[PDB]
């Protein structure tokens, strides 16, 4: 600077293509698969017959559709989308037994937005109004949901990974069968993205010893719509140097660490044990108190099953000029509670995370960490 035990297993997807939930829009209801995205704030759905789409929102068939007479052009890093703003009745079949009138951006043109071969047709932006397009007056879906119903102002995500991937989005609550041990909370620094503060970073218990502002330059966010653990350039360089040193029993090309090439091992091998564990200490709920979340190589070394030329992997930790992004590689190790009502995010060891006989993902605390307020950019 529609009970919780009907919401378990309501998410699906394919490797690297994100997680989606089934939703219905309009009257009579039109079924659509929608990407769950904690890194954005618009409910944007394909509304034209793009050849890649299995289905799309047909506004002419909805008696409850209302036109907002406003368009939006949304450029981003990787592509763009253009939409026509409107409102309609929205429901989540494997969610709460409610129907809400929400803002919907009917996508009429796009570039590198929809994925060739994916099974989703829209995006559910679960973040705050501050980052909604075109401005903060366009109420996000979750804000409409809580304002129009008795649904508690909270949601939780268990992203399991694996190929078909699966998980759970518990809307309005927490399902205690989705995690082991205790939930540990980090404050939401500002209600725009789900912004958090990282106070310390360790590779196999070894501190990176950097000025903690570097870990949050210019922000640190929790984003279900991003695959990688993205780190600020300076942090990435120190983390890679430490990971290289920890795994020095086997040498890999420079391109592997930069995500420019895959590394392959025999059909049943993979030396998980040579790769270090990665710990992120998050600001706690109390003055000078923190906790740490720990991920395994099973989270940050992603298998690539698309290879047509051996078991090949992609290093899923990458450099970022937009700050730290705690994507799927972080989230797949944990049960994540987006406690909007208390402006905090809870982490707990996921009951579905991929691990081995020697190591497990961990959420531990409390730790004493001084000057935590100084870590925020
Ligand atoms: C309001 O407009 C938002 C809409 C949302 C994206 C666009 C997008 C498309 C696909 C996926 C995508 C692909 N594969 C897998 N997962 C997600 C992600 C995004 C974004 C970028 O980053 C995050 N968080 N969301 C950013 C954009 C500014």
Swiss-Prot record:
Effect of residue 218 to N: Almost abolishes beta-cleaved soluble APP production
Enzyme Commission number(s): 3.4.23.46
GO cellular component: axon; cell surface; dendrite; early endosome; endoplasmic reticulum lumen; endosome; endosome membrane; Golgi apparatus
Reaction(s) catalysed (UniProt annotation): Broad endopeptidase specificity. Cleaves Glu-Val-Asn-Leu-|-Asp-Ala-Glu-Phe in the Swedish variant of Alzheimer's amyloid precursor protein
Protein name: Beta-secretase 1
N6-acetyllysine: modified positions: 70, 209, 213, 219, 233-234, 241
Domain Peptidase A1: 19-348
Cell compartment(s), UniProt: Cell membrane; Golgi apparatus, trans-Golgi network; Endoplasmic reticulum; Endosome
Function statement: Responsible for the proteolytic processing of the amyloid precursor protein (APP). Cleaves at the N-terminus of the A-beta peptide sequence, between residues 671 and 672 of APP, leads to the generation and extracellular release of beta-cleaved soluble APP, and a corresponding cell-associated C-terminal fragment which is later released by gamma-secretase. Cleaves CHL1.
Bilayer topology annotation: Single-pass type I membrane protein
Subunit structure: Monomer. Interacts with RTN1; RTN2; RTN3 and RTN4; the interaction leads to inhibition of amyloid precursor protein processing. Interacts with SNX6. Interacts with PCSK9. Interacts with NAT8 and NAT8B. Interacts with BIN1. Interacts (via extracellular domain) with ADAM10 (via extracellular domain). Interacts with SORL1; this interaction may affect binding with APP and hence reduce APP cleavage. Interacts with NRDC AND NRG1.
Full protein stretch here: 37 to 445 of 501
Domain comment (free text): DXXLL motif is required for a proper endocytosis and retrograde transport to the trans-Golgi network, as well as for regulation of lysosomal degradation.
Induction, per UniProt: Up-regulated by the Ca(2+)-regulated transcription factor NFATC4.
Tissue-specific expression: Expressed at high levels in the brain and pancreas. In the brain, expression is highest in the substantia nigra, locus coruleus and medulla oblongata.
A biological process from GO: cellular response to manganese ion
Main location: membrane
Changes after translation: N-Glycosylated. Addition of a bisecting N-acetylglucosamine by MGAT3 blocks lysosomal targeting, further degradation and is required for maintaining stability under stress conditions. Acetylated in the endoplasmic reticulum at Lys-70, Lys-209, Lys-213, Lys-219, Lys-233, Lys-234 and Lys-241. Acetylation by NAT8 and NAT8B is transient and deacetylation probably occurs in the Golgi. Acetylation regulates the maturation, the transport to the plasma membrane, the stability and the expression of the protein.
Any one GO molecular function term: protein serine/threonine kinase binding
Side of membrane Extracellular, spans: 1-377
């Amino acid at each position: 600077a529609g009970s919780f035990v009907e919401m378990v297993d309501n998410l699906r997807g394919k490797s690297g293509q994100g997680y989606y939930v089934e939703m219905t829009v309009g009257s009579p209801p039109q079924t659509l698969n929608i990407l769950v995205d904690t890194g954005s704030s618009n409910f944007a759905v394909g509304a034209a017959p793009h050849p890649f789409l299995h289905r799309y929102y047909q506004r002419q068939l909805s008696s409850t559709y209302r036109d907002l007479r406003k368009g939006v052009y949304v450029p981003y890093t990787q592509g763009k989308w253009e939409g026509e703003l409107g409102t309609d009745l929205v429901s989540i079949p494997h969610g709460p037994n409610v129907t809400v009138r929400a803002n919907i951006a009917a996508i009429t043109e796009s570039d590198k937005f929809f994925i060739n071969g994916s099974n989703w047709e829209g995006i559910l932006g679960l973040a705050y109004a501050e980052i909604a397009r075109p401005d903060d007056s366009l109420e996000p879906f979750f804000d409409s949901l809580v304002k129009q119903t008795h649904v508690p102002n909270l949601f939780s995500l268990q992203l399991c990974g694996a190929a078909s991937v699966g998980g759970s989005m518990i809307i309005g609550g927490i399902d205690h069968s989705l995690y082991t041990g205790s939930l540990w909370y980090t404050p939401i620094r500002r209600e725009w993205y789900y912004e958090v503060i990282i106070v310390r970073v360790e590779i196999n218990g070894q501190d990176l010893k950097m000025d903690c502002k570097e870990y949050n330059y210019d922000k640190s966010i929790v984003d279900s719509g991003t695959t990688n653990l993205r780190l600020p350039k300076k942090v990435f360089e120190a983390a890679v140097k430490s990971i290289k040193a920890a795994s020095s029993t086997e040498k890999f090309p420079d391109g592997f660490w930069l995500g420019e090439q895959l590394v392959c091992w025999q059909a049943g091998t993979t030396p998980w044990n040579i790769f270090p564990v990665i710990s992120l200490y998050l600001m706690g709920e109390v003055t000078n108190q923190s906790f740490r979340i720990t991920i395994l190589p099973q989270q940050y070394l992603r298998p690539v099953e698309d290879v047509a030329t051996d078991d090949c992997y992609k290093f899923a930790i990458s450099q970022s000029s937009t700050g730290t992004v705690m994507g799927a590689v972080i989230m797949e190790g944990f049960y994540v509670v987006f406690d909007r009502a208390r402006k905090r995010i809870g982490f707990a060891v996921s009951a579905c995370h991929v691990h081995d006989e020697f190591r497990t993902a961990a959420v531990e605390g409390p730790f004493v960490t001084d000057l935590m307020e100084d870590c925020g950019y």
